């Protein structure tokens, strides 16, 4: 349960970073589209 929390917490931290990156790139894509 030290290998388990390390591996789950880190993967959820990485997933959340990728979903924020994707939000950044959709707002960028929507904005390029308006223009």
């Amino acid at each position: 349960i030290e290998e388990e929390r390390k591996k789950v917490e880190e993967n959820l931290k990485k997933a959340e970073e990728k979903l924020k990156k994707a939000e950044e790139l959709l707002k960028k894509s929507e904005e390029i589209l308006k223009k």
Partner: protein, 42 residues
């Protein structure tokens, strides 16, 4: 028409990067749930 096109190109290039990131996120969420499962089994 030419400038409306290049803007669509650049919007879809960006949209394709967003999807790549969502794809990588789902790969991370699988590893997470798998980690939980391995702890229940073990």
């Amino acid at each position: 028409n030419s400038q409306a096109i290049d803007n669509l190109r650049a919007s879809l290039e960006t949209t394709n990067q967003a999807i790549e990131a969502i794809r990588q996120a789902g790969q991370e969420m699988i590893l997470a749930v798998q980690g939980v499962q391995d702890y229940i089994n073990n």
